[PDB]
Structure formats: structure tokens, C-alpha cells
Amino acid sequence: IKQGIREVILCKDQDGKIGLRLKSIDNGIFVQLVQANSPASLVGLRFGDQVLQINGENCAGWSSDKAHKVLKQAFGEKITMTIRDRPFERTITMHKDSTGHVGFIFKNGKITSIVKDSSAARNGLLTEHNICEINGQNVIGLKDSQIADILSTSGTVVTITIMPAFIFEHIIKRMAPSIMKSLMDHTIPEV
């Protein structure tokens, strides 16, 4: 979560796709989903990102349907976006015990309990929060077992990006879980 407003240059793929769905929240526009192997994924758009501008047009107060339209109407040699990095999210760092726990319970992405004397307790992890990312990798739409697998398989250090469930549930609505599971980019970023 960066306290900054970066700029990205997109470029439509061969099919006129950039691999993005946007959702209106509280009179801004925010990334609802990012397709793997897309211009959006390569330029490093993330779920949760705020789109402040598109081609120097402010997005204040747009509907979703309009932001999608805007993206169609555009000469895709170069589309230029202004992005505030995941405004609604925060990142916690944790360390595992000898027994390879960080110390919480979660369900459907949502942390539901913190365990006394855990690193999760020491670090102030909160319940009623949807897990968005682990060590920089989006996990949204995965199943809990797979998130466990990423956590079980992560180093001694774990890093989680969380979002308040109320806000999370309001972003993902109007989107069917299988799309989230199949299409939402869940890859380590390329370099």
C-alpha cells in the first residue's frame, strides 16, 4: 500500500482487451478484477487499485457501465491511467512459530478469529477482513485449502494484504465466484 499516485501506460491486446473490470465505489472507480496474461496484469494493476484518471479524464462519480464504455472508446495504441495504490487495503507482516503458524482462523477469505500469543496477535491482525494478497500474490477466489497451502508453503515470513469485508463484499458483488477463481490473476508478478 503505497502513499502515491503512479501512472501506467496500457495497450490493448490483439482482441481489443486490456483485461480489466472496474467497479464504482463511493464516487470513485476501483479495480474489481484483473485478467491473467493481460495488459493490465503486465503493467501491474491490482485488485483494489483506484483509477483516478483515464486519458486525463477524471473518474469522479462515474458509474461502472460508463467506465467500461470509456475503455471501449479509446485508440489502444496508448491508454494512460492514473492510479492510487490499493486505497482500501493494508498490509501486515507476520512471523511463524516453530510449528509454522501465524495465528488466525479464516473462512471464505475472511479472517474470523485471532489466536492468543500469536504473531497475528502481536501484529494486530483484525477479524471481519477479507484476505486479498499473500506475499504480493492475489488469492481472491481461491479456496481456503489453497490459501492454507500458500501460507503453509510460504517462508518463515508471511505478508498479508487485507480489506474490510464490508468494502470487499461491495467490490466483488455482481461477479460470479468462478470468474474470480478462473480469471482473476493469481500469479507472482513478472520481471
Measured distance CA(81)–CA(78) in Å, rounded = 10
Query: CA-to-CA distance for 2 and 42, rounded, in angstroms?
Result: 18
Say whether 143 counts as a known binding-site residue.
Answer: yes
Nearer to ligand YDG, 65 or 97 (CB): 65
DSSP code per residue over 71-86:
HHSS-TT-EEEEEE--
**Closest approach of Cβ 68 to ligand YDG, in Å?**
4
Task: Report CA-CA distances (Å) from 25 to 19, 90, 113.
Answer: 20, 18, 28
**143 part of the interface to ligand YDG, by CB under 6 A:** no
Region near ligand YDG per CB under 6 A, out of 12-20, 66-74, 91-99, 100-108: 66-74
Q: Which is nearer to ligand YDG, 79 or 167 (CB)?
A: 79
By CB under 6 A, tell whether 68 contacts ligand YDG. Answer: yes
Question: Rounded to the nearest whole angstrom, what is the least distance from the CB of residue 35 to ligand YDG in the complex?
Answer: 17
Q: How far apart are CA 5 and CA 22, in angstroms?
A: 18
Determine if residue 144 is labeled as part of a ligand binding site.
yes
C-beta of residue 11 within 8 angstroms of C-beta of residue 77: yes
Beta bridge partners of 91: 161
**C-alpha to C-alpha distance for 151 and 57, rounded to whole angstroms:** 40
Residue in 11, 57, 58, 69 binding ligand YDG, rule: CB under 6 A: 69
Name which position in 65, 97, 128, 149 contacts ligand YDG (CB under 6 A). 65
**Interaction of residue 174 with ligand YDG, rule CB under 6 A:** no
Contacting residues toward ligand YDG, per CB under 6 A: 65, 68-69, 72
